[model samples]
Target: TLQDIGVSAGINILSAFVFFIIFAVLRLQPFNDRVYFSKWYLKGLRSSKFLNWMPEALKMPEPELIDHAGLDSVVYLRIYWLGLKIFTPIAVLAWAVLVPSMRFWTHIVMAYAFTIWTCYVLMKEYETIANMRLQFVASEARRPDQFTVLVRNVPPDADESVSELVEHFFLVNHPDHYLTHQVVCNANKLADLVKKKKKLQNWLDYYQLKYARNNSQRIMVKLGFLGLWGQKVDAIEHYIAEIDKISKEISKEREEVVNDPKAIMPAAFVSFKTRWAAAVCAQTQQTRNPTQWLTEWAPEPRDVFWSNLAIPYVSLTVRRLIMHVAFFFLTFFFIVPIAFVQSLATFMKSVIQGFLPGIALKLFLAFLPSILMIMSKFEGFTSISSLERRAAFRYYIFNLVNVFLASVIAGAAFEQLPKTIGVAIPMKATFFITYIMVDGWAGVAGEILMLKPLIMFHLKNAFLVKTDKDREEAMDPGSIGFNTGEPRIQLYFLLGLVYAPVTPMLLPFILVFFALAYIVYRHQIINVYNQEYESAAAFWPDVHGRVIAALVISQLLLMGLLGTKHAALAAPFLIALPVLTIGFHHFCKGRYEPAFIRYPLQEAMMKDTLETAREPNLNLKGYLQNAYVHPVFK
Candidate 1:
């Protein structure tokens, strides 16, 4: 049995090394440069000093370079480093000592040591991230959003416009610090028009380029459906005429958004005389009602989800509750809907087997994360960091319910929701071994290849590229998919803990996974993914919190597993693990979480003082007046 596991571990480890080698080679290639190393290029941190361009692509600047890119990149890298730090030692003791000893007391001993070590790592990382976040804020240049708060649900005044009401409220409440405010507009319709116009322009470019390359032969298409009927016309001319008409309509819409008082939303970006005042408004209650006149740090202009600016605070809260309820039913009682879909698929077995089986399950797996991301946007998050953090939270829940519970129950998680009192470790150990090989070895290899982005780039180039700008758009290496990637590794953390005692053989597989993931992701961090915008690693708290939760869950599961094994003494001793873990979690939350969530008054005041001293006659009013304007107007 040890030989069998050794073979499996050897195979997986070999593949993991191969994955790294492939990345090293790919990182050197010119054409593959962006997809493999876009962050350095995006941030102007790439090593242009290298003799050869290929070597330049492979060479990442020193640690300080991460500072230029953003805080989130460092945070992302730290999570990978954390995996190695937390698990490598645990993996050693679990196999070297516990497996060899094969005693109940040793199992309990390992779990205790494991919990304490995990909590130490989590708590330490939290503090580190908090300090980094504070440093990030204190050292940053003045940003428009730093001195502005986005206030939602301004009490509507029939006589006064939303802008007037906002000004009235702020002047009365904060006359000493109030400088200026910008009212947001209801630009959904305008945004749609602009988007449609952009698409039409791109199409026109495509067709014109096609015709130009085709020796002056004009491309023809039907005026009616499917290009098979009705009057034929030159496609390029059709798109040009269409864009011209829409451009005129866009001008009229833009004018309305600007001059029409009714077009404005019940929200305004209120700028203060100092960062201290803005920070105070964001942290404290404005109105006694609490629900109305909600104030929060305005996200940077580029980060604003303009479509969501109109949603009132109450509706956003209500939507979150509704989504949570939906997520619960979707995760646990998914069979309720799947059975209904299954009824209609009786006669389509082949199709179902090929493409439809597990389709409903997959849909729900994705459903909650998607809904939560939209909800975060609708709640008017100003930064990609906040949106990513909210999405990460939702993703963890999906994995907890779908992966943790589903794996615990073997194949009948939905069919028997809460009926399974317990499952023997022996029953699932074999299944987990197979899962490790598939998910660990195959998954890391997939990461190196970057199959999704590679295929996507090729497809976009074929249909979308018409010029250098178009090719750049096609080659755009997307920001890292932390919303998806981080949680998947977290799931592996859960698995490593679960199988440590019940099946020590599985430890090697997890060890290999974490190692491979670390190298692969490290390379990608330095090379592949670009940060959309830096939030200075504001997401670290959420990531740390979830890892702590996983450790707690693992403790409880170990307690359960021991109880099933008839080791009453060892099981009772294990009860303290979860308790100590939760206590540590609270300690972390109180000590470090505020650093992420709140701005210190002293820090804010100091920044304000320094700013005023540096530029005594700053024109903040003029600076922020047009900053919050809708993209359609821009």
Candidate 2:
């Protein structure tokens, strides 16, 4: 009666909630300045100070990295976790336990679809931003200083032979060697010298040499390079060949180490540093062949100006055009199969809840061959984990634990909570039979499990500066930048795939987009990580904040849409959102984003000078939490 009749009080209460919500969205650093303390309620956050007081514990062993391996076992565990959790079972039980109706299914499916779509869009936006940032970072990128070369020093006559040798080097070294006179090497084109040398070699048994072009002084101490016998070439050829042989040996050994399967992601990143550094010593005109290479990496633009988004638009248009013409000739032909499948699925739903389990199995059994063909193509672990196969197995087990935990929490809310409280929770319809159980119990427990992995992953990235640098300095010159963006991109897509069972429509799009972004990001990763003193200070983005904002915004839109028919019922959460803004901001601040993306608000915000549009993050926070943090227009 109080909530229903005390209209003014309700307004005041809801207004306060609105302010709290706005505060949650803003997550403003400036707001921390005010100390409007309520003596009884306010508690300052001082966990950092507490940490300083406690003695440090012994270092925990670092977890191993994940790489490609044993995926079926991993996925099975995931399925088992989902199935074993009280959520799925109770969802099943609700069929017999609760009176069912078809209308609830419609709501669940719609909500599920919306969630999947929102996530998909967010993923697309994130990939776009990360790619652009990477490209920009690598622009005017540094190259290797050392050129791996075939240096032939000792000749019949040092002067004439060395000049010819220098000339031959210019052929590969200078693209404009023959065209310009300004560059000193322009006077010598190696093509002429090499032809002359072939004739001259037969006439005179002068020394010859072949070595990887490089500027390193330590490229020494080897024997029998390019079939050059001892005492055959002069001092210079001997040194050059010896260096070349040693460098080759070193490269081979490095390759073995890198391909060891147990080598970590950090270690692999360090390996690229050596080759990238050596590109700097290379000849100015023909530097690509050098030992040290400065990668040309730049942050990719996240905006849609140049991307796969354009492809879908173009493809859609062309497809529609083609379809229109084709359909003109065959309109009736396509109607048969589409109608049949839609009717079949709908007809099966008329059957009772107990029937679905058998139907699902029987349908899958009939479709297993097709499923095998389709799914097998998509198998393989895509993440760039430091752990080898065994570690990946371990990680999967951990993930399984988490999914089950989440399910259990969700389950409790559905089956037990409402009955215990003697309240009518929203599980009246047939559609909610499964969802109510999973959501009620399993969801709460599972969400708590999410806390650790989220925090640990962020902290790991924040502190992961040093040991990576150590390994880069020790690399041999021959190896660098060859692998590009293979495994890491794979992992991003793998994450996307994990969501596929829930929303299967999304897997292909995620796969395709991730592949593109990975290519761009890989180039940037190799460029940045391999820099001698490179720091990730410029790249660590607050992607989480933006994603959170988007999610909140989405919810607000949903509130308005869902409440159009029953606005009174919807107005509580809506009005409360802006009023409770401060509390909302406190909840989201200082969170870390996935390393692949940085958020728009923290740094590298997209600028729009023309419209002079104000920043959205602050404004959004203000609107959601109800407090007037700032005006959106300003």
Candidate 3:
């Protein structure tokens, strides 16, 4: 069995090694530059070397070069480094030190001390990130969102149109700061029409190009049902007529969106002449009925979910209440989810032998996290940062139910129940340690391969690319998928801390995964990924909070482990950790989190004063009036 274990580990390490070698070779080629170096190339930052081959091109970029990648990128990469700092020595000492046979009293003291250290680091990181976010906002160039407020739930009226009403309301309340406003249209139907027309147009281009290359050998296709069986027609002529008909429909829809008063939504992008005014508008209520004139800091034009902008406050509350109940059943109701999973396992058991049974469980681990992401959108968060943060909460609980509780004993999740509060948990240590090797080590190496994005890129290029812009779109090095990614990293931190003292061998596997991930993501951020929005690392506080939570969970579980062993004297000391850890969370929430949620009056005044003095004659109305139009309309 030791031989078998050694063989599996060597295979995993060998697989990881081969992945790194392939990654190194692939990143060196020039055509793959956009795939790897989009972050650098997008900013026009040229690498020092001419040939961008090995060694020189792959050198860790300068601090300034990485800094230009955005605060989110800079901060995310630091997560890996933070792991290195926290765990490297802990693993070394745990392995080198005496048999992990510390006395009960000594384990309790160390656990207590570790919680304090974790909280201290969390507090300091939150403070640092808050300072960075404020500085980023103050120092960054002028942005339309900085001086704009998204107003929703404008009270309906018989006399005035949404546009005229938005103007009148803002002009009356914020006359000094008010510059312009852009009313949103209910353009969902029109957007669908435009999308369909674009598809037809692309088909037309494809067929025409094919026809030009072969005029005598004209192409023909069946008229219906994916060409299964129908009347044949010339492919080129059919596409041309379809595109023309769709174009006329698109024109009609555009006219209706522009001219029809009924198309307008009760939302507007109201912009101000100064950041001070925007801040005031966001913080202060505008009407006697608070729900009627709701205003908040506008998300960047690209970040706005235009469809959700019109959701009334009461409607959003109802959706959340419904989701709250749904989430609870999804979590605590054992039979509902378990039975559903078993049904899938039964069906899939035929396709493969050992693997599909394992996949039955793994599919859930993958599927529920994505559901949480979908839930984030319906919950009505405005920013991507908030969306992912909410999803992380959903994912954390999903793991607690689906992974932790299920494997606590060996049978169903309900089988373990209260029995998991004892030595039974440590019995599963080997399972988790092996899990780290298979999942963590193998997984990070797989990130370097990027099998999904790589395949998807070529498929899109082959079928969709028709211009330089299309090719550029095809070269999309996707943003860090924070919704799916951050929670998983926190789970690894959870495993590391809980097992560090009880079963120290797991620590090395975690450390190796951390080291490997640091290099992998560093390459990704530098070469392979491009951020869609820079929230100035607004998710830092969430990441910080979760790590603290992991410490708390690990401490409590360690208490459980020790308690079952009859360590009665250590009970009072163990209780102190959870209390102190929770208290620290509340303290940090008050002290540093305000800097994230709202702009302080002092910072607002400083930026407003500077920008006004610098750009004395800037055209506020001209810049913002057209800035917030729906992308479909644009």
Candidate 4:
């Protein structure tokens, strides 16, 4: 039986080794620079000769990391360091004492001690991230969002246009601080036209380059049905005509969008003369009817999810309710099809039993985060950051139910109630060990190699790339998928916390994953992932809450495990753990949570006053006039 786990570990270790060697070799190729070091390229930081990559990446100090990337990235790195801090001592203590002593009472005692230790680390992290966030926000360079608030649900008035109404309303209520307002427009159609024109322009450029390369031969292409079944035509002339047509349509649409009253939405970016005024407006209610004039801190111009800008307050509420019900069904009932497939595979996997379940589950899980992200999109979050945050929560719940609970129960989620989870959990330790290898070790290794992007870049280079711009376009250095990455890390955290007391053998595998993943992601943040938005570690609270939730879950399960071991009297002692953990969560929530959510007026005033003394006179209105305009219009 141990041979199964041993064999799985051997296979995964070899796979991880292969991936790392390939990544190390391929990353040095000058052609692969965009794939591996696009962040540096984006920053205009020149690459060096061969062999200096690792040393260069390692030598960058933490303060420079925060400066080069953003505070969000350094905060992300801190999580990995936090994981090492929490688990290293636990693993050492478990091995040095718990394994040798081996008593039921020891499990309960260690569980208490582990819970306290984990909570202490979490509280410290919360405090540190809060201070980091406050300092980052207060001291960062000036941006339009710092002095702006998003005002939504502006009730209609027949006498004035949306723009005039926004100006009049803000001037009346915020006379001293109001500077300007930019009304949102429904420009979805115009945006689509712009996208189409860009694509057509790219094609036109490609064809013109082809024609220029060989002046004698004319370029020909099919006119329709993916350029396969329709009439053949001269490619350069055809694209030129199409681009002209689209450009005309674009200008026409642009005029209509600007002139039409129906195109304007009820939402506006209402900017203030000072950050303090914007902070106050964002934090307080403006009218007696709470829903009439809604205000919140505006996301940065580049971070707004433009399509969701026009969603009415009533529609947003209804969509949220609908999505909640949909997510519930999605989490629970998703196993029905998986179970059916597993039964069919059971008929087929008699020859090889150890590997299929992990592989199959991994395949199924590959599609889940995207599905949850689409659901969050439909829920009408108005910023990409919030959308990703919402999806992370959805994904964590899905994993907790389907992966953890379903595996522990050894059946469908609703099939039969198990009296105790402790008994079932330890029995699955071997399986989880293999899972950590396949999913954790191998998965993180594959992340660095970026096999898909490697293949894609080459394919584009061979067939599609014709110029420097084309090559630049083909190098798709994607942003960090926070919706997927955060929840995946949380899954490992759940595993590490749950298994530490019962099966200390799992700790080393988890630590290796954390360390490997930390190094890989740190490299990624330094040389690959571009910062999408600077929330200044706004997602820290959710991270803290999830870890707290994991702690409570581990305590409850340990209590159940101990009760079955004829330590019923000792279970009462463990009861105080979850309660205290929850109390600690509430305390942290009160103490540090507001720093992430609200911009304190005192800090805002300090920054504003400093800017005033430095600049003496600045054109606030001109700076903010077009900052929030639709990108298509811009």
Candidate that would win on lDDT: 4
Query: What are the TM-scores, per candidate, against the unseen true structure?
Result: 0.84, 0.21, 0.87, 0.91
Can you write out model 3's per-residue Cα lDDT over 1-634, one digit (the tens) per residue? 2443455476677777777777767767775656666666566664423223324434665344346667777778778767777776556655654253346766776676556656666677788778777777788888899889988888889999888899998898899889888887778777787888777777777666666666765445454546646333576677778878888888898887788887788888899988889999999988899778899999888777665755665688988888888788777654454445434332233333322333345445667766787877888776666677788888876766656555553433333334355665665565555556666787778677776666666766666566675656666777887776776677778877787767777777778877777766766776667787767677777787778878888888887778756436667778888888888898999899898888888888999889889989888778887897888866
Error of 4 at 229 (Å): 5.8
lDDT by residue (tens digit), candidate 4, 1-634: 4677677777778887888788878987888778887787778786433324445667678878898999988898888788898999999988877676248778878988899899999999899999989888877998999989999988999888888888988999999999988899999889999999988887776667666776755535365446666433577777889989999999999899888889888889999999999999999989999888899989999898998886776699899999999998997787775564344332223323665566767777898988998999998888988998999999999888877777666532323324556566886676677777877888888788887778888877765676666566777777777877788778878988899988888888889888878877887888887878888999999999999999988888887777765536875688899999999999999999999988888899899899999888888889988898877775
RMSD value for candidate 2: 25.1
**Poorest 10 consecutive residues by lDDT, candidate 4:** 343-352
**Each candidate: RMSD:** 5.5, 25.1, 4.6, 3.6
Rank order (by lDDT, best first): 4, 3, 1, 2
Candidate 2 per-residue lDDT over residues 422-454, each given as its tens digit: 121121112122221122122222221223333
* Poorly placed runs, candidate 2 (over 4 Å): 1-591, 597-634
Q: CA lDDT of each candidate?
A: 0.70, 0.28, 0.71, 0.82
lDDT for each residue of candidate 1 in 84-138, tens digit (9 for 90 to 100): 7887888777778756424667778888888888888877878888888888788
Model 4 scores a C-alpha lDDT of 0.82
Q: Candidate 2 clash total?
A: 133
Say which candidate scores most in TM-score: 4
In model 1, where do residues sit more than 4 Å from their true spots? 1-29, 44-63, 214-233, 332-383, 412-430, 433-441, 450-471, 565-572, 613-617
